[PDB]
Design a protein around this ligand. Structure first.
Ligand SMILES: Nc1nc2c(ncn2[C@@H]2O[C@H](COP(=O)(O)OP(=O)(O)NP(=O)(O)O)[C@@H](O)[C@H]2O)c(=O)[nH]1
Ligand SMILES: [Mg+2]
Lengths: 171, 130
């Protein structure tokens, strides 16, 4: 027995931590090893939300351009997308604009979006200030959270938010 | 633990074998008016057998769906690990027969994810009912 079924999508450059964010949230696990995703995968975790049970189907995409075509094919089904960058990698942040393009070009017009600056545990190598992240997301009308899959910061928050936000279009 | 599934399928036919008899006996009365006491007793049990049968098919349906999932998951996991090892090799090093079979395997890995996604749509199918 479960009540709902939301399909979510993670996109962003290879290495920003999409799989770790998903694994944190799904398995409460974290791999330090970089094991690049091949094509596409998904996990399910059914959560207890607001007195109410919801099964989330979260699609994880390969960040490499080698699999770009494969991954884009999965955009139209998403009820919500995380655009992820790495706060320790300026270039991954610069690429957020391009990834916003593919969403608006291939997902549903009402798909709900959310930018995550991941690896916010790594202070000594921060290349993107939280203020630059927060104001970009304000600029796109997109919610913003800094996350750490490693430190388990705001991961549950991130998805629980995106899903209450989905639920809210119901109700 | 999948043996429970097979245990259930034999249970179901026993139910269906006994319901078979009961149904003909319950329809045997009624099409006559031969007895209407014994008859409600039969109607009592037929009804009992029917959603005993339905409870079981529902439990079987969820068990089968679970088995196919664990199967697909482990096939995915093993093919993923496999092609991680394959792609990790430089392309200048392999026959082309193998670069082309890597593409086939890649396509296979995608079909597996889609087969898994099919079961998800399938599972929430069976759950709109109760
Ligand atoms: N310090 C820190 N490292 C992290 C964090 N999230 C991920 N990493 C690390 O960054 C690397 C890449 O993570 P991964 O989840 O595989 O990235 P990805 O975006 O899925 N890559 P791809 O698109 O290639 O599949 C791993 O070594 C992982 O341990 C985090 O919050 N903090
Ligand atoms: Mg990945």
């Amino acid at each position: 027995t479960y009540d709902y079924l939301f399909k979510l999508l993670l996109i962003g450059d290879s290495g920003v931590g999409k799989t770790c964010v998903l694994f944190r949230f799904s398995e409460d696990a974290f791999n330090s090893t970089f094991i690049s995703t091949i094509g596409i995968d998904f996990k399910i975790r059914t959560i207890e939300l607001d007195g109410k049970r919801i099964k989330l189907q979260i699609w994880d995409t390969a960040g490499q351009e080698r699999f770009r075509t494969i991954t884009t094919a999965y955009y139209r089904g998403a009820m919500g997308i995380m655009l992820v960058y790495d706060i320790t990698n300026e270039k991954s942040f610069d690429n957020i604009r391009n990834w916003i393009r593919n969403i608006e070009e291939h997902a549903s017009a009402d798909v709900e979006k959310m930018i995550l600056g991941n690896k916010c545990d790594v202070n000594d190598k921060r290349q993107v200030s939280k203020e630059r992240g927060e104001k970009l997301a304000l600029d796109y009308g997109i919610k913003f959270m800094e996350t750490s899959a490693k430190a388990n910061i705001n991961v549950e928050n991130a998805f629980f938010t995106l899903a209450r936000d989905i639920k809210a279009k119901m109700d | 633990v999948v043996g429970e599934l097979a245990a259930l399928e034999n249970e179901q036919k026993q139910i269906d074998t006994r319901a078979a008899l009961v149904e003909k006996r319950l329809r045997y009365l009624m099409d006559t008016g031969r007895n209407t006491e014994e008859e409600e007793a039969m109607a009592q049990e037929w009804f009992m057998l029917v959603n005993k049968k339905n409870a079981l098919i529902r439990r079987m349906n969820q068990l089968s769906l679970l088995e196919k999932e664990h199967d697909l998951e482990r096939r995915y996991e093993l093919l993923n690990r496999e092609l991680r090892a394959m792609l990790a090799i430089e392309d200048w090093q392999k026959t082309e027969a193998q670069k082309r079979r890597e593409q086939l395997l890649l396509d296979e890995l995608v079909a597996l994810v889609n087969k898994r996604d099919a079961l998800v749509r399938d599972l929430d199918a069976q759950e709109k009912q109760a």
